[PDB]
Design a protein around this ligand. Structure first.
Ligand SMILES: Nc1ncnc2c1ncn2[C@@H]1O[C@H](COP(=O)(O)OP(=O)(O)OP(=O)(O)O)[C@@H](O)[C@H]1O
Ligand SMILES: Nc1ncnc2c1ncn2[C@@H]1O[C@H](COP(=O)(O)OP(=O)(O)OP(=O)(O)O)[C@@H](O)[C@H]1O
Ligand SMILES: C[C@H]1Cc2ccccc2N1NC(=O)c1ccc(Cl)c(S(N)(=O)=O)c1
Lengths: 841, 896
């Protein structure tokens, strides 16, 4: 935290490996004032970031677990996700860069003995792959060994720095002159005071970019901060102390480098001459080192910019310096990898491997990113990426903190004495400007990537992900989309038939379920209703098991539908309950499907009264109605007639009245399935005998505007003609036993006799509906000579006004329309509202 | 007798008018009877040849026909030109198939491409697409005009009479020409269509002239330039490629030729002016594409057989015997071009000359006329399309300021406003006269339009709503998807930075539209897709078996009108959001049973109100004679599959002391039924009362106040889950939870060890614990007196009555208490008053209070008595008070 987090492992991330290896080179190629200015700017950015980070962090009682968790809990998830993503990418890239640097340093140290294995560049790649793999192996080695090694590494770094200070001030010596050291010289400081450049990066902004990579203490105050036993007043003090120590130490090291170093070397130990014999001038006249040809032809084997590492030859204890620098770099790399792995795990903390169940997947992904970026093996190019990504993360964090302070977040009131919104705004602006100037295209691309991640990771749908399992995820998705459907409004183009099918137990009547499932499959909603008769105190354990078994039987058949059971005294009341309550939001039924009463004659008229009352209630609630009739009745698994292909047969529609199109829509959706996609479809309409031609061409035109693709049309001009004499008689015998026989008295004086049997007919009444009933039986004749071999028959259902059409007269009509056929007859009626259109709004 | 079917009843027969939503020559409009009346008691228009095909054909033909195609065929050979043409045709034909498929679904109105794309895909993408489309057309007009000016200036200089210089004459001529075009477009579509036919005639005459010229034997000038009439040897020569220069690669020729044929929407853009668009768009577009492709192939093949690749052009170079050494087949007909073909420096031939197709023909002014006509036709088409698209887009009022445009004029609504806007933009652009750095932007915009059209088709097909029924059935969705992908690929393959800019503009406009929240509804594939996903995921959840590991609190809240008691809604929504189902109930009494549109409107308004406060709940209403029956209905039937409630949340009836006793009877009956259904129960209570937007204490900050929990009965831990889930939020995060864990008062409490173990398993962070053993103690007799006073009015004073005859008096007054019951329920009535003593000494400054809800056996308690215990328990307290008792099921499965 302070060394392994601030100034040892964050040393190589602030003032360490990336400073103990190639800091003196930048300082020499820049000068004292320029290096001081770069250090000042970096320190300012880091200090503002650290102030904001600590002030935000110290808000509320702290429960350990991760800085990502803390930031998310303080600023919400919207910004927390983006912050975590940016930190993950930056940590992986930094691990890659530090590992490459350490491998290169180790390879050079080994090469100091003059023994090449493979090549200058390739060998570095091999060593780096080996080191990264070793870290991956040591991913889960131990816990307290880490702290022990941190203490040991801090001690070793301190000892190496002491040795470096002891050996740095080299007095006059041939061994020193071999490297160029000449101790203190005012002319040396004068030379350092001026600028000088060499290389493609010979621009001060290049020095700024190089220095930015080694400032991971402020982040160390953000990512290496949440390890304080007393979280109250532990964090900010550590941040300030680490930052100040780093700054002072860096300034001192730069001062020593500029004081006791030279900018040129010789390359030959005994390269000296006498006065007047051979070129010799400059301050080298003290040690006779001329490089005029060497200066001209970039001939500096050793020197400030000539050689990358001057301190290694400047310190007396070379092995100690090498060992300490290598240890510091390894510690920094391990810390960064640990941080990225923690980010991944804490993201997935709530598959698990081993006790901790740690996410090996995230650490493996971090290793993948680091290995992908580490093959290049060049610090000069790599470091700018680290600087840019880290600066983007820090700027986003500070700006978000300032925004939260400004907007008065619901639960934002951090207790930081020195916190101020204006400082956050200033830091955001300055950081943005510096990131833009450092490298235009790269920084802009990173900003665009960050914006994409911030916009496109907050519309996922299941934003919680509770209880990782199958049932849990399924429930989460179902809830998310069901709630989402609430904001979307309704339009005619997207009408859908939601069906409530009265099946009772589904294993008693499978024809209805087959027929409805045919045309509703993955297009709209289907519910199967079951009413339980009798009074009982519900609850009980067995009802749930019964429902579960019914749903299992349903599932085994590959039928998408929901089962549902209710308790009521009688069928009508349970049906009312189902019609009024069942559904969710906009997924609620609007059509009722009911079977035919095969034996309505040998039964108590009370049952018939209730049956007709069901239809009356359905019409009251604005539903559509469908009555299905089979010749044989409806009451491994059984096999039905809708599970075997139909063939070339026809579908016959008798559209006699306008309902809104429901009579036409149901057959259209049914022929769109590969079971009824070979049947030709016929439409019958009534008309006139003296205008048959002007009626055929008109209905055909209307059919083409709905774009339903139906084949033929036929007109019927004789629907008013008198029925046969032997057929109109069969209608009288059918209703004979329902004649109250009081058709000579006041309608006031016929309501009393109906209070015990409100299902009779009045001789007055039969005189008003005489015409209508005749048209009912005449229709049956028309269907028998037209549709004796069809695969389906559809007819519009007639309506009777409540209070003027007893339950017995109504039941006498539907039985007449459908008789003597081999019927899959369907009688349909819409709610008197358009469900089709020929318009695009 | 013989009379129309329908004259003797109330029901009407089907007819066109019942579905037509417009006026008519017949002013009185017709409607069919509503279900309540049957139930219940007591203008110049163009065809397809002149309105679609001619426009598209003119728009496709350009200037590469005369000045570039022969050079391309000389550089690449016949076969490679044919392949390039074929690829371009595949892309264009697929796009045309998609547009035809989308164009026939209902009646299309004015608006062209924008109308189709938007109304069939949704306003959000349609707005940005329309904006960019109009801009692109308004710039293409200027591009074509500058091209025409270039041709005129080049000819005039050829005749040797220049005015100022290459750069200023272009400006002047272009300005004058654009002015003339603007003048033409304002005179009406009749004059506009006449000029199109005139230009078509001129181009046809040019084609015929070239064809006739390509036949006559060659003269001396033509012979010394490479023209020799159809010769099999030249044709044989001219099939292999011969690349030359920096621009000699297959990619280069494809990039040159591809933009030349992409103007295929020139006829659909005037869709508002057609006779029958659904029979006029597809046929015209396909025929135009076919004819243009035939013409391109014919030109390529014919020219590739008459001209040699090189020719000196000097008449003296003829082959006489003695001088020169002939090479190539040019010396088979008696001509010698050894010199230049050796040094590679002559200026004639197919691969070195640009105006070859005018040399071959018999009269060059005809070719000049052809170029003029092509350029001018393109400019006119672009102008008209841009004006119409802009008028239609500005009609819909989707942007803040551009609405000024959209005012029509006499008879046909003619947007002179948009005409002037586009003319001014075109002038401001033609002033520059240098546009080679502005062309790729426009091309990529057009390609984006292609991609959007194709994706609209594919998405509509894949969703497959019952309202998707097109008459044109000669397409396929996979091909459309491939077309959109290849469109974007080509975009990024032409010029990458322009593609980046185009896609960025599309994205930014889409974001602004989505943020603006349009106020219109037309019916799109997106809404149908949302229904699709809801249904599919519900079915998926239902498919899986049932198991205990997915407990969640699913609540039905009795709230009546949602905006009456908002505190209950806010409290439940606080801990329900993103985690479980919430439902709002409302019982309307109603005589009888019916549903009129008033109920539908009221419900839609309630749903809008609920969705306007960031609340996730379903609103449901029922009709019943009293409250108990409606609550029974909702408890029995609400839900779907697995998502159904298992907790009931109700508010306190603070006016129970002054009310007809049957009301409190039904309240307690509601509680008893809920208990009997295996539910959990929550009773909410506040000191004031529960009955733009109004505020509430549940939507404000809390600070550091504490929460007190009084756990006296082990019911499954629901008494602890609700307070716990309310402490993971950003508004209760600083509150401290105090637990007064009389661990199990009547539940075999644990003294010290197990008390902190159960709460430990709840990962609650419990920060404090206390012990209350003094329940039995005698409460201050002063407080007991307050209890006898309220129970007095319900006394039956039946001490001397037998237990058999006591039931007699209750057949009319079931609420009243008995005497034997007072002495029977005495010890259990002292705990309530005594417990109220303790609470009034700790949680007097506590944000919330939670206590275990007492219970009662049916019949063993008089109803009015049980309502006395509730009042005494929670009374004289400032904060909101919650009483809970769980279903007695393990709620510990919720954790992960
Ligand atoms: N318990 C029930 N739940 C839901 N609907 C029912 C129930 N019982 C009957 N129905 C509906 O009533 C219709 C037919 O009435 P009913 O069953 O009395 O005639 P049925 O089928 O001939 O009788 P049965 O099978 O006894 O001969 C069925 O198609 C069904 O829709
Ligand atoms: N129509 C209704 N639908 C659903 N719940 C209702 C309805 N009417 C009342 N309630 C519920 O019954 C509870 C008690 O209401 P009651 O009318 O018994 O006393 P109250 O004093 O009117 O209650 P409040 O002061 O909360 O309105 C309320 O908290 C409310 O949640
Ligand atoms: C971009 C300019 C410049 C140019 C140069 C050559 C060929 C066409 C051409 N223009 N493009 C068009 O005319 C064009 C392209 C695509 C489309 Cl759909 C259309 S349009 N008017 O059909 O909508 C026009």
């Amino acid at each position: 935290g302070w060394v392994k987090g601030v100034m040892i492992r964050c040393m190589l991330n602030i003032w360490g490996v990336i400073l103990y290896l190639r800091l003196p080179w930048i300082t020499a190629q820049a000068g004292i004032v320029l290096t001081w200015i770069i250090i000042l700017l970096s320190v300012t950015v880091t200090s503002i970031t650290g102030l904001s980070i600590s002030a935000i962090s110290t808000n509320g009682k702290v429960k350990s677990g991760g800085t990502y968790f803390l930031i998310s809990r303080s600023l919400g998830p919207e910004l927390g996700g983006s912050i975590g993503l940016i930190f993950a990418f930056a940590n992986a890239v930094g691990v890659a860069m530090h590992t490459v640097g350490f491998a290169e340093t180790v390879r050079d140290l080994l090469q100091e003995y003059g023994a090449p294995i493979v090549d200058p560049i390739n060998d570095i790649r091999i060593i780096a792959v080996v080191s990264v793999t070793v870290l991956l192996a040591i991913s889960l080695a131990g816990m307290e060994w880490e702290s022990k090694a941190q203490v040991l590494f801090f001690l070793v770094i301190m000892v190496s720095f002491a040795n470096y200070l002891v050996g740095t001030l080299i007095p006059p010596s041939e061994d020193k002159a071999s490297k160029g050291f000449f101790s203190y010289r005012a002319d040396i400081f004068v030379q350092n005071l001026v600028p000088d450049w060499r290389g493609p990066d010979g621009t001060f902004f290049g020095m700024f970019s190089i220095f930015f990579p080694s400032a991971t203490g402020i982040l160390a105050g953000a990512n290496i901060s949440g390890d304080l036993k007393d979280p109250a007043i532990a964090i900010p003090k550590g941040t300030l102390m680490a930052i100040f120590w780093t700054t002072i130490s860096y300034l001192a090291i730069s001062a020593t480098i500029g004081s006791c170093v030279v900018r040129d070397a010789s390359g030959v130990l005994n390269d000296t001459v006498t006065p007047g014999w051979g070129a010799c001038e400059g301050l080298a006249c003290s040690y006779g080192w001329n490089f005029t040809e060497c200066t001209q032809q970039h001939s500096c084997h050793y020197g400030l910019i000539n050689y990358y590492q001057t301190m290694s030859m400047v310190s007396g204890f070379a092995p100690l310096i090498t060992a300490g620098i290598f240890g510091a770099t390894l510690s920094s790399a391990l810390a960064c990898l640990v941080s990225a792995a923690k980010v991944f795990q804490c993201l997935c903390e709530d598959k698990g491997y081993g006790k901790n169940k740690e996410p090996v997947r995230g650490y493996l992904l971090a290793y993948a990113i680091a290995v992908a970026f580490i093959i290049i093996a060049e610090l000069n190019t790599i470091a700018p990426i680290i600087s840019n990504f880290f600066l983007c993360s820090y700027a986003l964090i500070n700006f978000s903190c300032f925004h939260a302070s400004i907007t008065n977040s619901p639960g934002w009131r951090p207790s930081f004495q020195y916190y101020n919104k204006w400082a956050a705004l200033f830091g955001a602006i300055i950081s943005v400007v510096i990131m833009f100037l450092l490298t235009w295209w790269a920084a802009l691309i990173a900003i665009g990537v960050v914006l994409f991640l911030l916009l496109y990771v907050i519309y996922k749908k299941p934003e919680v992900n509770w209880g990782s399992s199958v049932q849990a995820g399924s429930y989460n998705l179902a809830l998310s989309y069901s709630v989402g459907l609430n904001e979307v409004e309704d339009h005619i183009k997207n009408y859908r038939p939601q069906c409530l099918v009265l099946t009772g137990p589904p294993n008693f009547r499978p024809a209805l379920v087959d027929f409805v499932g045919t045309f509703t499959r993955n297009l709209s909603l289907m519910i199967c209703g079951h009413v339980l008769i009798g009074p009982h105190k519900q609850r009980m354990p067995e009802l749930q098991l019964i429902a579960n078994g019914h749903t299992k039987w349903l599932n085994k058949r590959k039928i998408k539908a929901f089962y549902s059971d209710v308790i009521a005294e009688d069928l009508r009341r349970g049906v009312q309950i189902l019609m009024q309550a069942a559904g969710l939001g906009r997924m609620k039924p609007n059509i009722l499907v009911v079977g035919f009463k095969k034996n309505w004659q040998s039964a108590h008229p009370a049952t018939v009264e209730d049956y007709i009352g069901i239809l009356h209630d359905a019409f009251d609630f604005n539903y559509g109605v469908c009555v299905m009739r089979m010749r044989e009745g409806l009451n491994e698994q059984a096999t039905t007639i809708f599970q075997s292909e139909q063939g070339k047969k026809t579908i016959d529609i008798y559209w006699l009245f306008d309902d809104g199109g429901l009579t036409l829509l149901i057959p259209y959706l049914l022929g769109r399935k590969r079971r009824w996609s070979k049947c030709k479809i016929r439409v019958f309409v009534g008309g006139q005998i003296n205008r048959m031609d002007q009626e055929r061409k008109a209905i055909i035109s209307l059919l083409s505007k709905f774009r339903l693709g139906f084949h033929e049309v036929h007109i019927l001009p004789d629907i008013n003609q008198n029925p046969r004499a032997e057929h109109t008689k069969r209608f009288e015998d059918m209703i004979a036993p329902f004649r109250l026989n009081d058709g000579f008295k006041d309608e006031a004086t016929v309501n009393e006799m109906r209070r015990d049997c409100p299902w009779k007919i009045s001789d007055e009444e039969i005189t008003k509906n005489r015409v209508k009933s005749l048209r009912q039986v005449r229709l049956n004749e028309i269907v028998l000579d037209y549709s004796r071999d069809a695969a389906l028959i559809v007819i519009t259902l007639p309506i009777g006004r409540k209070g003027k059409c007893p339950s017995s007269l109504y039941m006498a009509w539907l039985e007449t329309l459908s008789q003597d056929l081999r019927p899959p007859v369907i009688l349909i009626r819409g709610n008197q509202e358009n469900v089709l259109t020929f318009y695009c709004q």
